[PDB]
Design an enzyme around this catalytic site. Structure first.
Site, mmCIF file in Angstrom:
data_model
loop_
_atom_site.group_PDB
_atom_site.id
_atom_site.type_symbol
_atom_site.label_atom_id
_atom_site.label_comp_id
_atom_site.label_asym_id
_atom_site.label_seq_id
_atom_site.Cartn_x
_atom_site.Cartn_y
_atom_site.Cartn_z
ATOM 1 C CG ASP B 211 19.724 -12.438 3.049
ATOM 2 O OD1 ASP B 211 18.793 -11.681 3.016
ATOM 3 O OD2 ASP B 211 19.620 -13.687 3.203
ATOM 4 C CD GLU B 286 17.536 -8.544 5.983
ATOM 5 O OE1 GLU B 286 18.201 -9.577 6.145
ATOM 6 O OE2 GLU B 286 16.261 -8.557 5.818
HETATM 7 O O1 LIG Z 1 17.396 -15.023 2.461
HETATM 8 C C1 LIG Z 1 16.329 -15.036 3.445
HETATM 9 C C2 LIG Z 1 15.584 -13.685 3.537
HETATM 10 N N1 LIG Z 1 16.504 -12.672 4.079
HETATM 11 C C3 LIG Z 1 16.099 -11.263 3.948
HETATM 12 C C4 LIG Z 1 15.711 -10.940 2.515
HETATM 13 O O2 LIG Z 1 15.509 -9.536 2.337
HETATM 14 C C5 LIG Z 1 14.489 -11.785 2.187
HETATM 15 O O3 LIG Z 1 13.866 -11.495 0.926
HETATM 16 C C6 LIG Z 1 14.945 -13.258 2.206
HETATM 17 O O4 LIG Z 1 13.828 -14.095 1.951
#
Ligand SMILES: OC[C@H]1NC[C@H](O)[C@@H](O)[C@@H]1O
Ligand SMILES: OC[C@H]1NC[C@H](O)[C@@H](O)[C@@H]1O
Ligand SMILES: [Ca+2]
Ligand SMILES: [Ca+2]
Ligand SMILES: [Mg+2]
Ligand SMILES: [Mg+2]
Ligand SMILES: [Mg+2]
Lengths: 570, 570
Positions: B211, B286
């Site tokens: 993440d 991500e």
């Molecule tokens: O953790 C922060 C943020 N990163 C990316 C995640 O996919 C999203 O849902 C989240 O709010």
């Protein structure tokens, strides 16, 4: 199997097009200014180089405020370059050598010294509405301070609106104050553009390069409750309200109406060609715009047909010495992906408005860049000097004559704006003023490196940019370059291939290391390349000479190094 | 000429990865909240779909401010989803069915209800420097007027700095006030990230989705004269100082140091795979960033190795219902041109943060988009619902629970920011709450169209999005899709082709009309396609059924129509 036969293409679909800047090509009369007699004396150069067509920057009567782009008489020759007689001799001798000659047609604007403007400013019947004339914007808050009709900014700096004392109105100028915008909603203006093109076609021109088309049409004040609407502000803090960049040209650029004008020009040219026969006469359009607005020059989804092509400026706008091999591949693929079905691709590495090819890239990349130009499908465009690897010349503030620099810049900033360094005289040889002139007093200063970089030296020496250019224009006669498929991918961040292939005909491969470091690649990854293969062309400092055999699947390329390989047919 | 053998790839190089949003997948206990027992009950759904691997959005102990991305305990399950024993049962039954299971790892930030934070705020030894703590910016204009350390802006609106009364310092939150940024220059923090990953790998997780990686590291004050430097202003007038868009994240996003942490994670994971054997454990990163910053996740020029891949978000960021066939080709070519040699490509069409695939595109494009996903080389990523063409659900202001909407929006604007429409319960059937729950009281409202769009209905009816999905995942077992070359070009503004080819194996061709108008194409232009060819899959609205023979080289495609053709080997 014996080689397949190919149908011959119309001349414009695969020509090498060379851009002459007449003021800097060849001075025949010792005034330090290039001229038509000088071009005539060197028409043999284009045959020697393997050029098919020449386009000259403007040579029409002009006060020379924008070195020819400010035209006072669209029907005669600028006295410094010659006479109408010199122009007709140029067409005769060019045609006798098999060359096509295109003129620079400047439809957006006329000199303020043209009869059109003098007559329009005087509200002479038939000319009153020839240009875009506007009353000041109502200032109810504070009359006695006059407001321009809108915040529109000129390409050359300052307001695009100029007050006429005589007519007590503003006229529009997207370019210099002296470059007045025609009203392209005027049927008399549209007819005058056909009359100008017909005049020069009848003299024997093979077509036009069409200047500044994105700027043809601006918002009709009838659509904005009878005022010229403001362009949106950019918000960019580095630009004040007199500086180009302050506005987004929503109401002043790329209006859908401009394309109807271009489609009408093509319909006119088609009818001319039908009624005259001989070689197809063509129009190539100039416009810097996004991909969507650039492809609309070819035509549209409803079947309209426009320019034979819009110029592809991608190697000017989107590639530089900061680019890696993946950038080279992704940008080359943009024109080939978005161009409409049946459109002719074209490639432009330089012009008189932009830094020279080897200055935008690197000195060790000249051969690789000229190979991309010649080996991609379609039309190669060469700017004067690229065939010998000329570099930007130094031009002091004192020697600077570009209106763009003089208006937008000062002795500290001028170099950021000036187009003069790409306009320095052509290097024929190592004689006085590089053989451009018998005079030492040239209209711009001759670049300091002319002793090192000149055409005569490159004809004399065994390996040279020019000799490589000649080998490449010669290769374009092969069916594989005129009719062959293409495949293009990066092998690494540093090296890409371009393969031209055609069943029963020889395969040609560019390998080009565009990086500042050595690179080793597996030639097994290159489609349609069976080894051994023969080096057809190499970069002037390659370890490989033309005629060298490539036998190993592992190939180490130096920084800048480029090869064309000839391989067996698929 | 009998079909060549191909060497089987490691599982992660061509898996179909399915993203589960646990809260909205399957509620087993009637609380309107999806849970781990729910998931276990439908693991057979992934075998039925041809899914190889499942990645779950966060299931760790969390106050649920950001529905699991605010983690208070990294070592245990969120109570509403179940227990550690439920998790161990999920891995056991998923592994029994041959599935790989990945967990959502959230290294950038912890909940302010984490022990890490409570101890840090109290300055307990070993925790004092676990998060980014800063003094107020000195105010020489009016000493002791409290200023934030910098102008940095949170992804969820407002300052990225929150005052602690207890500690008399600001902490950094790139996300919600409740999500506190760890200090990734603290070796204790880096150790704790290995400790978390080792814990879950020891339970038998097949790896992690990582993440928010672009936000890991921010400017060191030691490089800015002992302050946190302001991010540059964007100048965009629609954004005030408290609004995301006001700044350019130069000092807060994509710092080169973040990649060194990723390479350290991959070095640890390689050592774990080497010492434990069994199936390769992987990390998929991500990050929404430009192409250069995205490709650095794979590795760098020095030979460092990072994530098995960063997610390709191009079908979210760069294509939509506004895109034509030339846009589709040019965006597809971006990953394949820029990805390092040896990289595994991946394709993402949706996630819990973006509008659903059929809403961003059109309802009649669902099959063609699922074909692209499965027929492009490398890894297909599916978001919960795309296998049945689920559309965005309506969510009123009153039913909205996304912190991004609640923080950045209001009753008139919330629809601009909210992710909730893409998180509405999954449509199993036409029972109460679409068979997501036995309760009518679901944590988000069930979309209105569940009677028209549900899995049970698609499994019964002769032609469906799900049957197409099944046909495409099965096709991925063919050597042509695992090891075949690709060729992609636009035939028109409306239609493009994608050819997968491999000598001695069958040829697979996608033809896709992405437009709202009928298109007629010449199949003679499609490389490696010999007619007759067989329709393998067709859009549910196509006049052609699976088994249909294409014999004519002229092909008309209706708006949104896609065909996969099976054609003889090359
Ligand atoms: O953790 C922060 C943020 N990163 C990316 C995640 O996919 C999203 O849902 C989240 O709010
Ligand atoms: O005519 C205006 C402008 N058009 C484009 C020309 O190439 C440039 O030199 C000129 O200044
Ligand atoms: Ca105009
Ligand atoms: Ca961080
Ligand atoms: Mg002269
Ligand atoms: Mg091929
Ligand atoms: Mg539940």
């Amino acid at each position: 199997p014996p080689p397949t036969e190919v149908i011959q293409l119309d001349w414009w679909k695969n020509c090498v097009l060379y851009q002459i800047y007449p003021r800097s090509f060849k001075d025949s009369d010792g005034d330090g200014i290039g001229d038509l007699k000088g071009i005539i004396s060197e028409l043999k150069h284009f045959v020697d180089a393997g050029v098919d067509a020449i386009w000259m920057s403007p040579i029409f009567e002009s006060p020379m405020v924008d070195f020819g782009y400010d035209i006072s008489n669209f029907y005669d020759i600028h006295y410094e370059y010659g006479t109408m007689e010199d122009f007709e001799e140029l067409l005769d001798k060019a045609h006798e050598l098999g060359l096509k000659v295109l003129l620079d047609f400047v439809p957006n604007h006329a000199s303020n010294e043209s009869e059109y403007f003098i007559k329009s400013e005087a509200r002479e019947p038939g000319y009153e509405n020839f240009f875009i004339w506007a009353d000041p914007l109502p200032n109810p808050e504070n009359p006695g301070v006059r407001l321009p009709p809108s915040n529109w900014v000129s390409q050359f700096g300052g307001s695009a609106w100029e007050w006429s004392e005589k007519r007590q109105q503003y006229y529009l100028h997207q370019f210099a104050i002296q470059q007045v915008d025609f009203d392209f909603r005027n049927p008399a203006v549209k007819q005058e553009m056909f009359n100008i093109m017909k005049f020069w076609l009848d003299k024997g021109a093979d077509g036009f390069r069409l200047d500044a088309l994105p700027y043809l049409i601006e918002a009709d004040p009838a659509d904005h409750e009878g005022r010229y609407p403001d362009d949106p502000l950019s918000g960019l803090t580095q630009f004040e309200s007199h500086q180009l960049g302050y506005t987004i040209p929503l109401y002043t650029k790329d209006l859908i109406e401009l394309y109807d004008v271009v489609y009408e020009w093509r319909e006119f040219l088609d009818e001319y060609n039908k009624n005259h026969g001989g070689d197809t006469r063509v129009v190539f359009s100039e416009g810097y715009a996004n991909v969507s607005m650039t492809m609309l020059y070819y035509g549209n989804e409803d079947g309209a047909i426009g320019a034979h092509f819009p110029f592809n400026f991608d190697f000017i706008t989107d590639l530089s010495s900061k680019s890696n091999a993946r950038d080279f591949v992704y940008i080359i693929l943009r024109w080939l992906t978005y161009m409409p079905y049946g459109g002719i691709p074209n490639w432009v590495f330089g012009n008189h408005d932009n830094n020279r090819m080897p200055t935008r890239f690197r000195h060790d990349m000249v051969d690789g860049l000229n190979i991309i130009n010649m080996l991609l499908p379609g039309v190669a465009v060469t700017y004067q000097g690229e065939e010998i690897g000329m570099r930007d010349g130094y031009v002091s503030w004192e020697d600077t004559v570009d209106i763009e620099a003089c208006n937008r810049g000062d002795p500290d900033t001028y170099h950021l704006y000036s187009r003069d360094p790409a306009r320095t005289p052509y290097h024929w040889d190592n004689s006085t003023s590089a053989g451009f002139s018998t005079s030492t007093n040239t209209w711009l200063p001759v670049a300091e490196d002319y002793q090192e970089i000149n055409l005569a030296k490159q004809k004399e020496t065994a390996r040279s940019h020019f000799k490589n250019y000649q080998a490449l224009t010669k290769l374009r006669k092969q069916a594989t370059l005129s009719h062959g498929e293409y495949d293009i991918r990066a092998l690494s961040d540093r090296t890409f291939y371009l393969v031209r292939s055609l069943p029963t005909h020889d395969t040609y491969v560019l390998l080009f290391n565009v990086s500042e470091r050595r690179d080793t690649v597996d030639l097994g990854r290159v489609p349609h390349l069976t080894l051994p293969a023969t080096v057809y062309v190499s970069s002037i400092h390659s370890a490989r000479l033309a005629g060298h055999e490539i036998t190993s699947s592992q190939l180490s390329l130096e920084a800048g190094e480029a090869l064309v390989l000839k391989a067996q047919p698929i």
